[PDB]
C-alpha cells in the first residue's frame, strides 16, 4: 500500500523535556536503600497489599 504515512505518530507527539533529578545511587548503596525500604521500614497494613507503583 501507500508508504507516505511512515513516521506519522512519532512526528505528531508534542515534545516534552525531561526534568532535572538528583542522581541515583549505585552499587551497594542502591541495594541498601532497597533493603531498608522493603523490609526494615514497613507500615501496618490491613491485608490489601499494594504494589510499589500503585496509583489510584
Amino acid at each position: 500500500g501507500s508508504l507516505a504515512r511512515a513516521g506519522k505518530v512519532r512526528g505528531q507527539t508534542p515534545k516534552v523535556a525531561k526534568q532535572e533529578k538528583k542522581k541515583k545511587k549505585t552499587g551497594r548503596a542502591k541495594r541498601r536503600m532497597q533493603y531498608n525500604r522493603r523490609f526494615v521500614n514497613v507500615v501496618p497494613t490491613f491485608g490489601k497489599k499494594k504494589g510499589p507503583n500503585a496509583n489510584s
Binding site: G1, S2, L3, R5, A6, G7, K8, V9, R10, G11
Partner: protein, 141 residues
C-alpha cells in the same frame, strides 16, 4: 513389544537410527535440503543492497501496512524481503543502500501478522538503526 534379549543391541540401535528420521527437526538438520534452501547459508547475518521499498498488508484480524524492503544479498545474489522495525525508520533507508540483515527470531518461520517475512534490518549504511532512531549517530552522507 520391544525386544529385551541380551544379544539384541544391533536390532535396538538399528531401529532407533531408522526411526530418528521421522522427527521433523532431526531430518531438517541432517538432510541438507533446508541448508541448501536457506538464503543465508547458515549464517546469523548477511549484507545486501536495497532493491526497493514495499508495504506488506498485515494478516487479519489486524489491519496495518508493515514497511519492508526488497534487498539482494551480496554473497549469493538471492532476493529477500526484510522488515524495518520501528516508528518511522523507513525514512532512514534509501534505495541502492547497503544493509545488514538478521533473522526474525523463529528460525526461518514467519513472525506475527507479516506474511512470509523472516528477516529484519539491523544496520543501514554501516550505522545501526537503533542509533539513528535514538539520534545518537547521523547518516554518513
Amino acid at each position: 513389544g520391544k525386544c529385551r534379549g541380551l544379544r539384541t543391541a544391533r536390532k535396538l540401535r538399528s531401529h532407533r537410527r531408522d526411526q530418528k528420521w521421522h522427527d521433523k527437526q532431526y531430518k531438517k538438520a541432517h538432510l541438507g535440503t533446508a541448508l541448501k534452501a536457506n538464503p543465508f547459508g547458515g549464517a546469523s547475518h548477511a549484507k545486501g543492497i536495497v532493491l526497493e521499498k514495499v508495504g506488506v498488508e498485515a494478516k487479519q484480524p489486524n489491519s496495518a501496512i508493515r514497511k519492508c524492503v526488497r534487498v539482494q544479498l551480496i554473497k549469493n545474489g538471492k532476493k529477500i524481503t526484510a522488515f524495518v522495525p520501528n516508528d518511522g525508520c523507513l525514512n532512514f533507508i534509501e534505495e541502492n543502500d547497503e544493509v545488514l540483515v538478521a533473522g526474525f527470531g523463529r528460525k526461518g518461520h514467519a513472525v506475527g501478522d507479516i506474511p512470509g517475512v523472516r528477516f529484519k534490518v539491523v544496520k543501514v549504511a554501516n550505522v545501526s538503526l537503533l542509533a539513528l532512531y535514538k539520534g545518537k549517530k547521523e547518516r554518513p552522507r
